């Protein structure tokens, strides 16, 4: 309920393709998300994880988001007052491939996708403050 009003302040500067709100407490569920594209299709198996207790298999194996092939660059996800994980999409046959921030809150996960040729720092540092954001109201 008027949780795409997020989505929509996170697809505002243009510089941004996808964006998703996700819970993943008790029975996760995407909150909001960009309709049509990738991070609506996420699934609670996805959410599982990323939020799982392995966090070394995922970076030989890597991981999928709504179904899309994934890398992982760095994880910091657990760590307090860091919260986040850069990640960027696996493609193939030419196709590009996107920078990608995951920002955990205390109710959420805000996954942003940056558009091609965006830098991971400036989609990092979105996600981060928007997280934040959520963070001091409690989600």
């Known amino acids: 309920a008027g949780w795409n009003a997020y989505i929509d302040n996170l697809m505002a500067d243009g510089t941004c393709q996808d964006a998703a709100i996700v819970g993943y407490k008790d029975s996760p569920s995407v909150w ?24 070394s298999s995922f970076f030989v194996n890597g991981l999928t988001l709504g179904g899309q092939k994934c890398s992982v660059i760095r994880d910091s996800l657990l760590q307090d007052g860091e919260f ?12 590009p491939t996107f920078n990608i921030t995951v ?29 934040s954001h959520l963070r001091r109201s409690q989600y």
Do not use: Q
């Not at 809150?105 to 997280?131: D, R």
């Open 32 to 55: 909001a998300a960009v309709p049509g594209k990738t991070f609506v299709n996420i699934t609670p198996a996805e959410v599982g994880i990323l939020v799982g207790k392995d966090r």
């Open 84 to 95: 986040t994980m850069d990640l960027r999409t696996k493609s193939t046959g030419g196709a």
């Open 103 to 131: 920002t955990m809150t205390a109710k959420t996960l805000v996954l942003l996708m940056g558009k091609e040729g965006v830098h991971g720092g400036m989609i990092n540092k979105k996600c981060y403050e928007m997280a």
